[PDB]
Structure formats: C-alpha cells, structure tokens
C-alpha cells in the first residue's frame, strides 16, 4: 500500500511536469516558426522591390544607349 501511495504522487508529479514541459516546447516551436515565416515574407517583399531598382537601372541605361 505504501508503495502504491508513492507511485500515485510520483505519477501526479510526472504528468504535471510533462504538461509544463510540452507547453514550454510547443510555444518555443510556435514563436520560432512564426519568426521564420514573418521574416521570409518581409524578405520576399524587399527582393521584388530590389527588382524594381535593378529594372530602373536597366531603363536609365537603355535611354543613354539610344543616343
């Protein structure tokens, strides 16, 4: 009986810690994933604005090469 009593409270501690542990990890995973995505979205936005600059160079270049 004493042995069973120890196993019950130990199980309660284990499940409590497991819940804390999983919650801490599930959150870290989410904030990381969200950081990647938001960055990749802003990075893509800047890349095609970069393409608009490169294009403008090719336009101004094309002008002086027609004179």
């Amino acid at each position: 009986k004493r042995e069973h009593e120890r196993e019950v409270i130990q199980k309660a501690i284990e499940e409590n810690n497991n819940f804390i542990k999983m919650a801490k990890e599930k959150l870290a995973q989410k904030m990381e994933s969200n950081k990647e995505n938001r960055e990749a979205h802003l990075a893509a936005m800047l890349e095609r604005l970069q393409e608009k600059d490169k294009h403008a160079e090719e336009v101004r270049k094309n002008k002086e090469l027609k004179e």
Partner: protein
C-alpha cells in the same frame, strides 16, 4: 491567504477591470486613495477581502491586479483617473502599438516584445502571496490583444505556475458593438489556444448584455460604460465568496467541482437577477422566489442560448443580500415543477446553493437600482454550445474564401493554425453533443 491575482488584458479587460475594482472598493468600504477605515490591522491581515487586496504599511489597500494593453491610451485613463492612487505604477503596463484587431500581432509580432515584462510584474504580485490560489483573466475574444496576447500569456502562465488555477472572464463578440470584421477569426484562434490552459471560463455575450441594458434599464443605446457596470455585478457575484465570509458562504472552488465534469467542458452559463431601473424598483420588492424564477428566463442570461432546448450538467445559485435557505428551497421546489429543467442521466439533479449576507452595491450615478437581494445562477448547459456554433459559422463563411487571412499570414501565421483551431472547435461542439446523449 488564498490570494487571487486578477489580470486585465486589452481595452475590454481593462475597462471591465475599472468597473469591477471600483465596485469592489465600494463593497468593502475602500476609498479611492486605498484607505479602509474599518480595517484595524494596518499593513497586513488575513481577512476575506485580502484575497483581492494587499496592504501597505501606510494603510493603503492595493488590488492584486495587473493591467496590460499593447496601446497606452486606455490604461492612461486609469493612470489619471479617479482610482489612480489605488494602483502602483508597475501594475499598469502599456506598449506603444496595439495588435490592430489581429490575433497574430497580439500573440507574436507585438505581444512577444512585452510578454517577459508582464510575467515579471505578475511574479512580483505572486511573491507577495502566502498561498496563491490562482488567476482571474479578463479579456475580449475579438480584440487583437484580448485574443492574441491573452493566449500567449495563458500559455506562459501554465509554464511558470504549473497547474495553478486560471479562470477566465471572456467577452464574446456582438455586431452591435463590433470593432472588427475578423473578430470571429480571433475568437476561434484564442479559444483553441487557451482551451488546455483554462480551468473555467465565464463567457459574456455582449449582445446579451446589450439587450438587457436596452430592455431592463431602458438604455436606448448602451455604451461600454453601461455594459461594464452590469458585467461587474455578475463578476462581483461570482467572486463574492472569495472576498467575504459567512456561515452559508460557499467557496467558488466548490461550485467549480460541480460545474466541470470534463476538462474541456468548463464554460458555465451565468444568469443574473434582478436587473431593474430605479423607477421600476421603487415601491417594488423582488422576493427570493421572483429573482430565482428570473434565473430561468433566457432574457436574463449572460450568453444568448436556449437551455430549455438543452440538458443541464450542474445548477448553482449564488445569492447575496437578505436571503435565507428556507425561501430558497421553497422557490426551487416551485421552479422544478413548472420549468423546462432536465439534467443528463449521469449527473444528480440537486441545485447547489451559496449565500453571502453582504447586500448588493451599486456605483454612484449608475442605472441599476439598489436592491436588498440579488442572485447569480451558474449552470453547465449543453446549450452554451450554441454560442460556439454561431461563431464557428461566421468563421466558416470567411475562411472558405480565405478572406482577411493574408493579414494573419503576413504576421507569420500559417493556414494550418486556422484549420487546426477550427477542428478543435468542431470537436468541442461534438463534445457538448456527446455529454448530452443518454447512457447505454
């Protein structure tokens, strides 16, 4: 001991907090500067009101509360308001930019920048507790902060405080006082994320409160102030057992034992009575039987639904004022033989009763009449799932076209989170359907 820390998140949470704490002060005879003449133990004490108020050596009674918002203008009114002396400046936390009606910004982009600070300030309150019981979290479903930041906070609180109890007062969105078209999105996302981290959540349908203010107090177009003063009375009724003592006083945790049959089934339906104007209450005494019978009038519910078309899994009556058990039992006996009250077959049908002799209180220049007795019924009904159904439908209409989803994706979220959240709600609607089915 048995201290309770309140956390008020976003505009709705903060402004409701203002109403609640103002009401608490008047019920306990606490002045706007925090002084409480009737309290003879200076600088401390183990009285009942100490569950919600700490004490400084100068005799100031300070709310065990943190106010958080990602925008400063709402809390700035608290900082310069009537009860500005009540709170230590560190209890009032603000950012410079709100979540813009976006769950993603409240949970990730903007919220992550202030989450560590909030937890530190919460920790400072907890370290002043000799026996912290749990947290009470006030927030809206629809706001970006009330939605996004709350769910982040709830997750972080489960990590930092383990299985310490966390209760919710959640404002369910209504079109009459809507602030964004994406409130259904924010609602579903928060409910999903917070579900595992909340032990009990009291939803407050703004349309229900809007209707009651129009119908019972004859307010042609209720303001947030009108809604909040009514809400604070319901909140006061629920927390009354924690803030007062009495022979017939029943602790909220005991009601909670009956109200939550399964972890996910933790959304009680609140019903309050009497809500009546001064004009109508004059020369008009509402008896115990009358206010108790009013608890089974759907028009008086905090959430729009029809319990008469559902099944009960618990029924609790929280009385306050001039009330004795004899009149309660008589009123209940009458009601049982005249109302559509049916329980599931796996639960006992007895009503759990609590009485706090401390009479109801009203705020100066308010609309609510001051009455000698009031009652708040807390019932666990399958009918509350109707609130989920209405929200989930509005969610489906927009998400089938992915309307407004790009505002969330742009903040780093994925469509998988939307579908994951919606499936959890679908399972929750199914859960409430299953518990209502008769046993084999």
């Amino acid at each position: 001991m048995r201290e309770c820390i309140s956390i008020h998140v976003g505009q709705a949470g903060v402004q409701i907090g203002n109403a609640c704490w103002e009401l608490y002060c008047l019920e306990h005879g606490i002045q706007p500067d925090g002084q409480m003449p009737s309290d003879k133990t200076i600088g401390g004490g183990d009285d009942s009101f100490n569950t919600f108020f700490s004490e400084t050596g100068a005799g100031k009674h300070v709310p065990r509360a943190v106010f958080v918002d990602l925008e400063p203008t709402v809390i700035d009114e608290v900082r310069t308001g009537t009860y500005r002396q009540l709170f230590h400046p560190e209890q009032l936390i603000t950012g410079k930019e709100d979540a813009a009606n976006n769950y993603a910004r409240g949970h990730y982009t903007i919220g992550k920048e202030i989450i560590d600070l909030v937890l530190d300030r919460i920790r400072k309150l907890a370290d002043q507790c000799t026996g912290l019981q749990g947290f009470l979290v006030f927030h809206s479903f629809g706001g970006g902060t009330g939605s996004g930041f709350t769910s982040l906070l709830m997750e972080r609180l489960s990590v930092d405080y383990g299985k310490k109890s966390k209760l919710e007062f959640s404002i369910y969105p209504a079109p009459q006082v809507s602030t964004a078209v994406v409130e259904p999105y924010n609602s579903i996302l928060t409910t999903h994320t917070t579900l595992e981290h909340s032990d009990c959540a009291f939803m407050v349908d703004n349309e229900a409160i809007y209707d009651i203010c129009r119908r019972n107090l004859d307010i042609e177009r209720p303001t947030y102030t009108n809604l909040n003063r009514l809400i604070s009375q319901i909140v006061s009724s629920i927390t009354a057992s924690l803030r007062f003592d009495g022979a017939l006083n029943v602790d909220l945790t005991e009601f909670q034992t009956n109200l939550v049959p399964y972890p996910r089934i933790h959304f009680p339906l609140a019903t309050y009575a009497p809500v009546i104007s001064a004009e109508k209450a004059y020369h008009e005494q509402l008896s115990v039987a009358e206010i108790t019978n009013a608890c089974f009038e759907p028009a008086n519910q905090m959430v729009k639904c029809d319990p008469r078309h559902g099944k009960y899994m618990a029924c609790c009556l929280l009385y306050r004022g001039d009330v004795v058990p004899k009149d309660v039992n008589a009123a209940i006996a009458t009601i049982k033989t005249k109302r559509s009250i049916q329980f599931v077959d796996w639960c006992p049908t007895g009503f759990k009763v609590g009485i706090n002799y401390q009479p109801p209180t009203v705020v100066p220049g308010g609309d609510l009449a001051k009455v000698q007795r009031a009652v708040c019924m807390l019932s666990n009904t399958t009918a509350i799932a109707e609130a989920w159904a209405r929200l989930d439908h509005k969610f489906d209409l927009m998400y089938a076209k992915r309307a407004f989803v790009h505002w969330y994706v742009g903040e780093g979220m994925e469509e998988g989170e939307f579908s994951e959240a919606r499936e959890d709600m679908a399972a929750l609607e199914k859960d409430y359907e299953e518990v209502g089915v008769d046993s084999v």
